[PDB]
């Protein structure tokens, strides 16, 4: 059977980037060219592999990470980047093998007066390691006095909502992102390109 890419790419809602979703894809035929040839994706950037060679490769498993961020932040979903998203939300490794796919989702993910459902981690003390996921919601201590679960001065809830309104400039508009990654072990290959 064909790999269930539609479940990922056509999901009604995407995850918040701080709580980014990972879907394991396995035991199926992947036709990557159908993704790469699509006029839907404004970003389709592979690292450590060329898109036109994917259909010729077999992997143990494939993984699809997905989430929403601002247009201006899509550039952070790449090896070697810094900023609030790369540092505190979703971190690719410096030498990455995989593909980053993104498309404007203003028609789905903005709302008149604002869609506030999509969040990002604004406050964190240190950077994420590659592929780390932090879903904690402890009150963030910004001074020397402990917060003890109470918000206030120097005591901040660590997540913030994007304000996605349809009239936003493109850099402030929501983008849906899928990062494909590939796994090769001393195990049977379960995801190959079409025969």
């Amino acid at each position: 059977n064909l790999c269930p890419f539609g479940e990922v790419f056509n999901a009604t809602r995407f995850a918040s980037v701080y709580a980014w979703n990972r879907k394991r894809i396995s035991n199926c035929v992947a036709d990557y060219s159908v993704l790469y040839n699509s006029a839907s994706f404004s970003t389709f950037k592979c690292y450590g592999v060329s898109p036109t060679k994917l259909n010729d490769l077999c992997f143990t498993n494939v993984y699809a990470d997905s989430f929403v961020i601002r247009g201006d932040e899509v550039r952070q979903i790449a090896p070697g980047q810094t900023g609030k998203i790369a540092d505190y939300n979703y971190k690719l490794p410096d030498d990455f093998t995989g593909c980053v796919i993104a498309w404007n989702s203003n028609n789905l993910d903005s709302k008149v007066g604002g869609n506030y459902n999509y969040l990002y981690r604004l406050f964190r003390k240190s950077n994420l390691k590659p592929f780390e996921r932090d879903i904690s919601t402890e009150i963030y201590q910004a001074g020397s006095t402990p917060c003890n679960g109470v918000e206030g001065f120097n005591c901040y809830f660590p997540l913030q909502s994007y304000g996605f309104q349809p009239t936003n400039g493109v850099g402030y508009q929501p983008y849906r992102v899928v990062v494909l990654s590939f796994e090769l072990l001393h195990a049977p290959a379960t995801v190959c390109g079409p025969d």
Partner: single-chain antibody
Amino acid sequence: VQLVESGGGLIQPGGSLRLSCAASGVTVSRNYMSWVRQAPGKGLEWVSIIYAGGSTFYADSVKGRFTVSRDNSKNTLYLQMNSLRAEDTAVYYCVRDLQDYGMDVWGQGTTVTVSSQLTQSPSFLSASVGDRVTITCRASQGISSYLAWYQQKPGKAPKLLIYAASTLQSGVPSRFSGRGSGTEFTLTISSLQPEDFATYYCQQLNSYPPGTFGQGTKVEIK
């Protein structure tokens, strides 16, 4: 809570300075910390930022020449300023940067003298005590509610009034209000008081490039 800048002075072009910002009541290493400067008679210009996790970013006007850094054991922020130019002349402010919630803590500034988009309307306004005063800030694209307002009294550091376009900063008098979403934003002072004669700045939050300020509206007597 205070930020105390030092290290400024009078120098010729080509020289170097190091600014220090000693913090108390906020922890430099746990915060976004920015440097913002203001040339004499001009508006605010964001210079650099350092993240809690260590990332640094710079205005194009200073890239390659300035370096922001910190010493956690001294709770101190630094700005190393090399290859200084006449146009780097300004007061340099240390600020604690809350991003979506504006720049809420400002130092008093240190003066550097080197010597051999958001549009506010009007640029100048004359008013009387008790007047209702409104100032408008217009963005070049839709920015939702990503706007802050600041007041800067003559000789003083700016003070945060409003963030998220309409949220009153804690401790700020209720006669200040902000409205707007999208491209057009207004600050209203419901009954102007003698202490309210100042210059007001809007700021586009989480902007690209970072730290976009309007050019300021000066509210003056009569």
